[PDB]
Amino acid sequence: CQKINVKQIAARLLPPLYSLVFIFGFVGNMLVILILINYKRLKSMTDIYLLNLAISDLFFLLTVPFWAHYAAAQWDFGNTMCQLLTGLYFIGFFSGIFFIILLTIDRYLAVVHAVFALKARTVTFGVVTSVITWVVAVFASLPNIIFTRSQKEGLHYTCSSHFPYSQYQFWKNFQTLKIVILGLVLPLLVMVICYSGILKTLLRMKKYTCTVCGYIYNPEDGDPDNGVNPGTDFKDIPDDWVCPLCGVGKDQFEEVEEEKKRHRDVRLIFTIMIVYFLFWAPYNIVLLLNTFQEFFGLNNCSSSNRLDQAMQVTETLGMTHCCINPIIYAFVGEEFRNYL
Ligand SMILES: Cc1nnc(C(C)C)n1[C@@H]1C[C@H]2CC[C@@H](C1)N2CC[C@H](NC(=O)C1CCC(F)(F)CC1)c1ccsc1
Ligand SMILES: [Zn+2]
């Protein structure tokens, strides 16, 4: 068996691709950072988390031109930069998802537990949680920065991670589960718990009109005369209940179209999380497949080279995501459109 040489392809394909993701990302993110302070004026907890999410992206973007040069030639920046850039990449990766989860839990706290929302959703506490988030991200990145060095291999310089020989398999497995759990498994649980909890709180809030007379059932008012307590969802009401005006069943009732512009905050943060999974989930799956190829997949010569190739391709897609977040704000968020 023998591995494949991708240097010839990558030295042609990666430098113009990376440079453009950089141009479009640096410009895109700086526009976001500026508009959040100079127009939006950081009024809520969302504004603090979205700001830090754009900083984590810029941190990721700062490393991009260095990767473009390394792909095209070699590592001409030394050891200091090698660790410092792999650092900003990891710190930028972890804090990025960490702030998306904090933007998810935030919407779960605003929709559900509305009484606790107004009580504990300050700008000062938002900054405090943000300081501790950037710290946790650093500690998560820390082992990966340490085992990264820039070494000369024959006539070429490299900037890669080299785990300790004696415990090579343990660090390979431990770092795989740390990236996969904190980047896919953990936020995926948060996306399931929160958004199903938000949707069930939203659903209760919907108003239903009688298609016969026009009676609008408000959940907040209910129907005490017939025995329907206030707050109760229309769907949750027994079928035997009739219209308090004409006397028709729940079947001859339709959903009132909603101006989901309150829920525009929920609709945007949902797109940030969903689109994060289109760029980062393919890499996270392949990472688990490549590390656990023996006893959990195909360990053969051909399949291993295919897995390593798929890992580079899917980490290239994941990297591209740092320039994608402004496009979501430009389309989903009506506020960003109003600035132009
Ligand atoms: C070079 C280059 N050219 N284009 C890229 C990407 C921009 C595509 N790069 C480099 C490849 C490397 C090294 C720094 C940064 C950027 N990448 C981190 C990978 C990391 N993954 C790992 O360290 C795992 C590897 C497999 C394992 F050992 F089994 C477990 C750990 C990571 C962390 C968060 S996302 C990816
Ligand atoms: Zn009626």
Q: Are residues 222 and 106 in the same domain?
A: no
By what method was this entry solved? X-ray
* Residue span of the structural domain in which 238 resides: 207-257
Is-contact 173 291, C-beta < 8 A?
yes
Query: What is the spatial distance between Cα 287 and Cα 314, in angstroms, rounded to a whole number?
Result: 9
Q: How far is CA 311 from CA 85, 228, 288, 298, in A?
A: 20, 56, 10, 15
Q: Which ligand is nearest to the CA of 216?
A: 2
Instruction: Say if 66 falls within a structural domain.
Output: yes
Q: Strands, E, within the chain: which ranges?
A: 148-153, 156-161, 208-210, 216-217, 253-255
Closest CA to ligand 1's atom 17: 86
- Residue 93 neighbours by CB under 8 Å, 6+ apart: 60, 141, 179, 183
Q: What is the chain's length?
A: 340
218, 194: one domain: no
Q: Strands 216-217, 148-153: parallel, antiparallel or unpaired by DSSP?
A: unpaired
Mutate which of 179, 285, 296, 308 to test ligand 1's pocket (most atoms within 8 Å of Cβ)?
179
CATH at 39: 1.20.1070.10
List ligand 1's pocket residues with C-beta within 6 A. 67, 70-71, 86, 89-90, 93, 144, 161, 172, 175-176, 179, 291, 315-316, 319
- Ion ligand 2 residues within 5 Å by Cβ: 210, 212-213, 215, 243, 245-246
Residue 330 to residue 333: CA distance in whole angstroms: 6
* Contacts (Cβ under 8 Å, ≥6 apart) of 70: 159
Within a domain: 28: yes
Residues 126 and 216 grouped into a single domain: no
236 with 217, same domain: the answer is yes
Within 10 angstroms of residue 319's Cβ, the number of other Cβ atoms is 23
- Give yes or no: residues 214 and 179 share one domain: no
CATH number, position 223: 2.20.28.10
Tokens of 307: 């897995």
Quick one: 187 and 287 in the same domain? yes
Resolution for this experimental structure (Å): 2.8
- Claim to verify: residue 82 and residue 15 sit in the same structural domain: yes
Q: Do residues 103 and 146 share a domain? A: yes
Pairing of the two strands 253-255 and 148-153: unpaired
Number of domains in the chain: 2
Tell me the CA–centroid distance for residue 263 and ligand 2, in Å: 29
The one-letter code for the residue type at 234 is: F
Nearest atom in ligand 1 to the alpha carbon of residue 144 is 23
Tokens read off for 122: 């300050």
Same-domain pairing of 70 and 166: yes
Same domain for 122 and 235, yes or no, is: no
Q: How distant is the alpha carbon of residue 103 from its chain centre?
A: 9
Judgement on whether residues 280 and 251 belong to the same structural domain of the protein = no
Radius of gyration of the chain (CA): 25
Decide if 320 is inside a domain. yes
- Domain assignment present for residue 2? The answer is no
Tokens of 185: 């498994």
> How far away, in angstroms, is 29 Cα from ligand 1 center?
22
- Cβ-Cβ contacts under 8 Å for 209 (sequence gap 6 or more): 215, 216, 217, 253, 254, 256
DSSP 256: P
Long-range interactions of 53-57: CB distance < 8 A, separation 24+: 53/96, 53/99, 53/100, 53/103, 53/272, 53/325, 54/29, 54/325, 56/91, 56/92, 56/95, 56/96, 56/99, 56/137, 57/25, 57/29, 57/92, 57/96, 57/322, 57/323, 57/325
Reading the block at residue 203, the tokens are 């659903």
Whether 1 is in a domain gets the answer no
The reply to whether 131 falls in a domain is: yes
Name which of 63, 62, 38 is nearest 51 in CA terms. 38
- Is residue 84 domain-shared with residue 164, that is, in the same domain? yes
